Design a protein around this ligand. Structure first.
Ligand SMILES: Nc1nc2c(ncn2[C@@H]2O[C@H](COP(=O)(O)OP(=O)(O)O)[C@@H](O)[C@H]2O)c(=O)[nH]1
Ligand SMILES: Nc1nc2c(ncn2[C@@H]2O[C@H](COP(=O)(O)OP(=O)(O)O)[C@@H](O)[C@H]2O)c(=O)[nH]1
Lengths: 427, 422, 427
């Protein structure tokens, strides 16, 4: 019933999702380069369309790039069905306005036809997952139009977006803050939940928690993929009690515009028996809630939580969960009105490279610092109108650039006001 | 045979089912395939339907708004035992909202559910009543169980309806919207059930942990304790006991006013596997254990509150002269109002478990229930007054006055249970 | 009385049977390369014709190959009597139609004369055992004509066939699905029981249960031979109560066209004291009924049994058999109409390399997945008529290729319908 349709938009979107699909295929027991399997485990129907002995991942692959199909065959074999891959003609040169306005009506109609076919092979739609990168030209503007279009066709369906935000210190292109704000404005309006990730945080993790020396994006994507595979464990491995995407939206989002979540996982293990059997839920909870495993450039132990959820995997003792979470409640800071704080869940099936593991998600007021940095960079460039012609000559009015900024500021102000008011909601 | 129909609603009520039903199968000498295993004992007919063949069929219905609790129970944990034509499954689940279970989604399944119930009712000449086992946490349990109860009471008004309401923990089972579903559903249980048992999972977790301080237990112990309490409550409805002979007698013994029907329980030895080796529990210790803090499946101290009714059901030989001295010896730990005699009733029935010398369970109508309700109500108010997560309920039809009504009903219920405290 | 005549057809047939004969000669106490013995044990008359002090295995050795006798002397010494070896002239190039149609009348008449002589040296015929491989050109087509011919001459005699089916993942030749379906069609019509074996399952067993590193077919054949020696223990070592081939057909086949059985054995021990004295019947039953020892590419714990049989060897306690089987009945799934489930037997004589051992056979609805894969591969090639000329230019009509497929589908549909109906036969 809780069938998931993934949408992958742009180069980052496809590489991250690619790593995810190949890890999913390892846990369920499917060949990552063929889709062919004889003996599989878990509820494979949530993510794969099985025809004969081939498990076809349910995904819509989208680009503006002229040769997206060949680019996939070369890395992912025949795992993805070519009928689901939508190729483009020219491309968006890191310009939100091209991905969003000047993309071609036909390109979008084909994406929608593919989505309709994928939702037509389901007894029910459990939700959509969008994987993309906010500073690009297709994963930002086209991915944003797709969220708009999907939410208009399927309102009341939980959309989760996983996206890469600018890094806190160094930036990629000068245009990046314009692409990032307009992408964020559309995430604010259309996603049910958004997971904020960035590369600076992930690199520190790759260099300090993984054994890899001099990691590249290929290694960095295994941290993101690990977040994605763990967050879908309960869905994939069932259980009498479990978590679907609609359970996460209901429990983590207290207001409709405060859905931006942080993510953290531990242990991080590269394939092979390179891990150590710590086997302790208490240690994993202490780690997942520390600042060192957070996949975004923020410092959550200094903020305040509105809500959080923790999913434990493997043979975790009930007694250790209760004690470990008691420690977490004592050490961290929560807002009074939400009085229960957490959503807790367990899935008895172990991740393939560790007997135990933990994934945590949550609403931490600290997240505004990511948005505030983006806002400030935009304001300086916008005031001087540097690289601005690239957006207004591609269909935007100054009004749209200003309204997108205003919406972003509204979310920041709402998170901060709530957080400051919170100090006295206890007296 | 006064027959009882058991309905399991929601993910937890269903999770419990295999433990509840395995206990009954072993207790009456039936295998898990429904086949007889030697001599059948007890009034088997009250809980099992006899097939056209030698197989016994549990007289039960399983309801889930998603497909998964049922799929695991009937395909992996207790294969071939449950009748697939008595399983009701939706697709969407409940997104943890009361609103789906009671107003927007679960309502489309009521024709299917009432049709299956009638098919089950039609197989019995003398129906005593219904037992509905449900979580009050999640939307399927919190929402549908009262929707189902109302539909039954309006069709079969002369039957006794009992619910087994399980309150989720503030830790392992927690949810950010638990207080909304708990208040919204207590509001309906108040008019739906004749008898409503409240079991608190936090008490189970601390009680078992205390008993287990000397060992590694098993992760299955928490579910076995919860399932066992229902089995023991029902023991007198299955054996020819001199107590709680029928659901109608439980109602007359424990509930003096239509609203004051929320009951607490106490159990000893909790589980056979918790009390192993030398367990000669003398009649004297068993009765002291049953009013001990570590045997009460609620955050209740009997000494702090007032009893309205109290029934102690023991199993095995329990000489009456001992039971009477144990009761007199309760002193002022067990106290009632000045408008009641100390109406404490105790006796014993048949033991089926070859590892225990004796055992027992109590049913209490005690003002301490009001403290659980106030705890949950305070949490409700903090969230409600600042609109936390209310959009998710309003989007599915819960006009705001619906929350306000539940708030007021529960505060009145708390006020009424505490009348004797003042 | 229950004398057995074995028929070995084609290269795989001869190599597998060869391994069997050499293991039989170890348990009875005969020289595997001479046939000469002084002191033997067991009822050697079931499989050997004893003349003087030489024990001559009763087998008909059949090939189309020009020098089959010399090829046997080189590996099996003088164990086999040359008068029983039927040589060919050219050979069947992996083409069922050559083994079946264009084989030479004389070749078949000689095989039949040899069979008649072997059945003429018996007080009674206990049954025939055919060993072969479905994807070959002689073990498929010629072996199939032999089953037809044997069943016409000796109706009411139990024929057991042991055969190698295509592996589930990789295939050998492109023609393999045509050879496999026509072979299966004839097995459906003429065998009393057929044991379905394949190499993919056997390789996993050889690599994980045997200590051998990088096993070849020579090692793989010792797993098949172990199945064959254990299934004939009660026959060879007598006993007051025992199992003949006619007991297995009566008990395991509820309908005439649902005789395809799975086989499983444990422990698997290579010659030498490399084993461990687990000595527990309970453990062996748990293992034989798991998926890890199944000698075919199927997963029986997820299917439903119509019937099954278990033969225990060695000093197995009655009490452990009863408890062990109670566990098996509780864990597995059976169809209601057959209410007793099992056929159980014991033979007090130990296998030579272990004090205890267990062999299990049975009808598990899961078996259709083997047949369904073969069917699908055929349908795709057949629709395109690839390599088809090789069959129609050798005497088959499209009608024969289509009718063989239809018979195979009938068996699949009957197994599946019965299995699905079974869920409600309990209410
Ligand atoms: N974590 C991660 N980040 C990536 C990857 N590829 C690109 N990025 C980031 O995504 C940003 C936008 O990428 P881009 O190539 O312009 O995407 P597109 O124009 O939307 O197809 C880059 O500036 C990088 O910071 C990847 O494989 N993984
Ligand atoms: N287990 C096992 N399989 C074999 C052996 N020899 C061959 N095979 C399998 O049998 C199939 C058919 O063999 P083939 O040589 O064409 O036999 P023939 O033409 O009928 O004599 C091959 O494709 C292999 O998969 C063996 O010694 N043991």
């Amino acid at each position: 019933a809780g069938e998931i349709v993934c949408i992958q938009v742009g180069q980052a979107g496809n590489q991250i999702a690619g790593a995810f699909w190949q890890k999913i295929c390892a846990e369920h027991g499917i060949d990552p380069v063929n889709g062919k399997a004889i003996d599989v485990v878990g509820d494979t129907d949530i993510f794969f369309n099985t025809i004969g002995d081939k498990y076809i991942p349910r995904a819509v692959v989208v680009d503006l790039e002229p040769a997206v199909v060949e680019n996939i065959r070369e890395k992912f074999g025949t795992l993805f069905d070519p009928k689901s891959i939508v190729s483009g003609a020219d491309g968006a040169g890191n310009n939100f306005a091209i991905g969003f306005n000047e993309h071609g009506a036909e390109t979008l109609e084909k994406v929608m036809q593919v989505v309709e076919q994928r939702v037509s092979e389901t007894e029910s739609i459990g939700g959509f997952i969008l994987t993309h990168s906010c500073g690009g030209g297709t994963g930002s503007g086209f991915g944003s139009k797709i969220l708009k279009t999907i939410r208009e066709r399927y309102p009341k369906v939980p959309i989760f977006t996983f996206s890469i935000f600018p890094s806190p210190k160094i930036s990629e292109t000068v245009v990046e803050p314009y692409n990032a704000i307009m992408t964020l404005s559309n995430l604010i309006k259309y996603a049910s939940c958004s997971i904020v990730l960035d590369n600076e945080a992930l690199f520190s993790i790759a260099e300090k928690k993984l054994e890899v020396e001099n990691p590249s994006l290929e290694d960095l994507n295994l941290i993101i993929a690990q977040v994605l595979t763990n967050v879908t464990a309960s869905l994939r491995f069932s259980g009498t009690l479990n978590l679907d995407l609609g359970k996460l939206v209901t429990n983590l989002v207290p207001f409709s515009n405060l859905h931006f979540l942080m993510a953290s996982t531990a242990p991080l293990v590269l394939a092979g028996k390179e891990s150590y059997e710590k086997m302790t839920a208490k240690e994993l909870s202490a780690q997942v809630f520390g600042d060192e495993y957070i996949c975004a450039a923020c410092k959550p132990t200094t903020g305040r939580y509105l809500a959080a959820s923790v999913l434990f995997r493997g043979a975790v003792k009930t007694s250790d969960v209760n004690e470990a979470m008691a420690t977490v409640k004592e050490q961290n800071s929560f807002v009074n009105w939400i009085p229960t704080g957490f959503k807790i869940s367990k899935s008895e099936t172990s991740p393939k490279d560790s007997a135990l593991g933990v994934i945590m998600l949550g609403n931490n007021s600290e997240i505004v610092s990511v948005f505030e940095r983006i806002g400030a960079n935009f304001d300086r460039l916008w005031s001087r109108k540097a690289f601005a012609h690239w957006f207004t000559d591609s269909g935007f009015e100054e009004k749209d650039l200003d309204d997108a900024r205003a919406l972003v500021q509204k979310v920041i102000d709402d998170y901060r006001k709530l957080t400051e008011d919170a100090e006295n909601l206890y007296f | 045979a006064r027959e009882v129909i058991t309905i399991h609603v929601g993910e937890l009520g269903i999770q419990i089912a295999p433990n509840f039903w395995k206990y009954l199968c072993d207790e009456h000498n039936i295998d898990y395939k429904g086949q007889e295993k030697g001599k059948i004992r007890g009034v088997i007919d009250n809980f099992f339907e006899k097939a056209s063949i030698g197989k016994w069929i549990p007289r039960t219905i399983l309801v889930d708004l998603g497909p998964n609790a049922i799929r695991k129970v009937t395909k992996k944990d207790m294969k071939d035992f449950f009748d697939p034509k008595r399983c009701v499954m939706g697709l969407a689940g409940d997104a943890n909202l009361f609103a789906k279970g009671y107003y927007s989604y679960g309502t489309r399944f009521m024709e299917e559910i009432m049709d299956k119930i009638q098919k089950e009712v039609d197989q019995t000449e003398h129906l005593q009543g219904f037992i509905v086992v449900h979580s009050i946490g999640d939307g399927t349990g919190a929402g549908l169980a009262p929707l189902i109860m109302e539909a039954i009471k309006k069709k079969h008004p002369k039957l006794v309806m009992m619910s087994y309401s399980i309150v989720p923990s503030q830790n392992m089972d927690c949810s950010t919207i638990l207080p909304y579903n708990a208040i919204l559903s207590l509001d309906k249980l108040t008019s739906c059930a004749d008898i409503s048992m409240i079991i608190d999972n936090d008490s189970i977790y601390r009680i078992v942990a205390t008993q287990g301080k000397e060992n590694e237990l098993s992760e299955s112990i928490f579910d076995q304790v919860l399932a066992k309490a229902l089995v023991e409550i029902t023991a007198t409805l299955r054996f020819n006991s001199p107590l709680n002979r029928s659901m109608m007698e439980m109602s007359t013994n424990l509930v003096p006013f239509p609203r004051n029907h929320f009951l607490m329980t106490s159990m000893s030895p909790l589980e056979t596997s918790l009390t192993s080796a030398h367990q000669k529990i003398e009649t004297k210790e068993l009765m002291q254990d049953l009013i001990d803090q570590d045997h009460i499946l609620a955050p209740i101290t009997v000494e702090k509150g007032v009893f309205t009714a109290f029934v102690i059901a023991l199993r095995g030989e329990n000489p009456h002269s001992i039971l009477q001295n144990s009761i007199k010896g309760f002193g002022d730990r067990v106290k009632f109002s000045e408008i009641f005699p100390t109406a404490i009733k105790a006796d014993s029935t048949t033991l089926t478990d070859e590892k225990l010398a004796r055992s027992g369970i109590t049913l209490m109508n005690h003002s301490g229930v009001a403290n659980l309700f106030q705890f949950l109500l305070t949490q409700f108010e903090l969230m409600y007054d600042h609109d936390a997560f209310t959009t998710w309920y309003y989007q599915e039809g819960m006009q705001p006055s619906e929350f306000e009504a539940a708030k007021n009903n529960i505060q009145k219920l708390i006020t009424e249970y505490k009348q004797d405290e003042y």
